[PDB]
């Protein structure tokens, strides 16, 4: 007594104004549900990983899908300018197929890890993989390597590239977060931190003035390059938070956060406040999503066999309509949101970077 169920915070908005239908029965033949979406930086191809196999790529104009026979699920997919798809498999290998045919072109291996987190930088042609104790970085063509950047001390936790700019940010098991000179194996930017975060990814804004750090602990660390240290502040999250699995960025001030309390959050960095708070069901839970950064169009695969076709601006205006009616009455959205405030220095991930 009395927990919060079912799909009351997800399908209830996501299906609000659809212009098409996902004929779910077309895609879900498994005794099972979609657990993750691995996806296209160009958003449209949203592949569905289930608990069965044949990872598919769902194509949302055709109401058809790409069937890529092998069962091996991805940690993430990268689709690029020329029609190719790179699949970072959970099997330790990254398999590239032509996205358009599902035809294998190459496999990248170097990683010996359960995690091969991907990020793609379309302006470097570089694909980065976060795995084991390193960052393998390579030409997006994915037939060679440029180099691997390494953590030779405490265990590597994670890292990410800047997609409409150029940098690599990585971190340690001890939360130390640092920035690399992408062409010199050089860490120019270093940190010493108190929050030790396991199971983290560092999310990078496309023009990386802004960064955020997730992890095994329920705290988020925030960066702004206009100020020193790059990581300036951090703070605790609304009650019930546990750990954070993923954060993505948009062109607005926004972080899209997947928290393992099975609630999606969206945060506005100008004060670092939570605009959106939306939960998913048991099976069929938070899966993952794609974004059009300038209207925040969302291409989310919900594990329920629904793809939305909702966006953050519509979900925001829904929340902001509540507020606009009350802005007329003086409501402060920062508190409505849960704006979180900077604390002390002894639990921070403060980081200097140039």
């Amino acid at each position: 007594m009395n927990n919060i169920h079912t799909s009351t915070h997800v399908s209830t908005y996501f299906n609000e104004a659809l212009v098409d239908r996902i004929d779910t029965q077309k895609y879900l033949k498994s005794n099972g549900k979609i657990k993750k979406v691995v996806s296209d930086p160009d958003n449209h191809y949203t592949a569905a990983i289930d608990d069965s196999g044949n990872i598919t790529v769902i194509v949302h104009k055709l109401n058809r899908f790409v069937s890529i026979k092998p069962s091996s699920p991805a940690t993430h997919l990268v689709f690029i300018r020329n029609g190719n798809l790179l699949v970072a498999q959970q099997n330790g290998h990254i398999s590239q197929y032509l996205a358009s045919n599902g035809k294998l072109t190459s496999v990248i291996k170097h990683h010996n890890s359960k995690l091969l987190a991907l990020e793609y930088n379309p302006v470097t042609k570089q694909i980065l993989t976060i795995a084991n104790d390193q960052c393998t970085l390579w030409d997006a063509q994915s037939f060679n390597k440029i180099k691997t950047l390494f953590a030779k001390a405490s265990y590597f936790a994670t890292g990410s590239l800047t997609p409409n700019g150029q940098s690599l940010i990585t971190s340690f098991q001890d939360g130390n977060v640092y920035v690399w000179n992408l062409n010199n194996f050089e860490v120019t930017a270093k940190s010493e931190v108190e929050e030790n975060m396991k199971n983290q990814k560092i999310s990078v804004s496309a023009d990386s003035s802004r960064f955020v750090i997730g992890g095994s602990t329920a705290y988020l660390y925030y960066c702004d390059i206009s100020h020193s240290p790059l990581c300036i502040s951090s703070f605790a999250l609304p009650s019930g938070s546990t750990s954070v699995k993923k954060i993505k960025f948009t062109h607005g001030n926004y972080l899209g956060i997947i928290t393992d309390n099975q609630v999606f959050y969206a945060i506005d960095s100008s004060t670092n406040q939570i605009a959106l708070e939306f939960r998913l069901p048991k099976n069929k839970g938070i899966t993952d999503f794609d974004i059009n950064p300038n209207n925040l169009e969302i291409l989310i695969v919900s594990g329920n066999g629904e793809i939305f076709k909702y966006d953050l601006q519509k979900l925001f205006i829904m929340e902001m309509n509540q507020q606009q009616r009350l802005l007329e009455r003086g409501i402060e959205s920062s508190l409505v949101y849960n704006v979180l405030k900077p604390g002390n220095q002894n639990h921070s991930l403060k980081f200097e970077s140039h």
Binding site: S7, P281, K282
Partner: protein, 72 residues
């Protein structure tokens, strides 16, 4: 404002240990102390489904919150 015993689930040969609900309002789940669980709906014309398994006692049944799988 009545405790309202309404209409019982017929059968359930002996030995009853639990019940739960499918929030369609309602498919009722229940279970016995030997080899059987049941799931059925009212609108009494509906016939219940008798599940076979749990050759030992079934202590409790609960539905997933959406009323889909019945756990036993």
């Amino acid at each position: 404002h009545d405790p309202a015993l309404s209409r019982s689930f017929r059968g359930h040969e002996d030995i009853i240990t639990c019940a739960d609900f499918d929030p369609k309002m309602r498919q009722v789940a229940s279970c016995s102390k030997d080899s059987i669980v049941y799931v059925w709906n009212f609108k009494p014309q509906q016939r219940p489904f008798k599940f076979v398994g749990h050759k030992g006692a079934v202590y409790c049944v609960k539905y997933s919150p959406d009323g889909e799988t019945i756990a036993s």
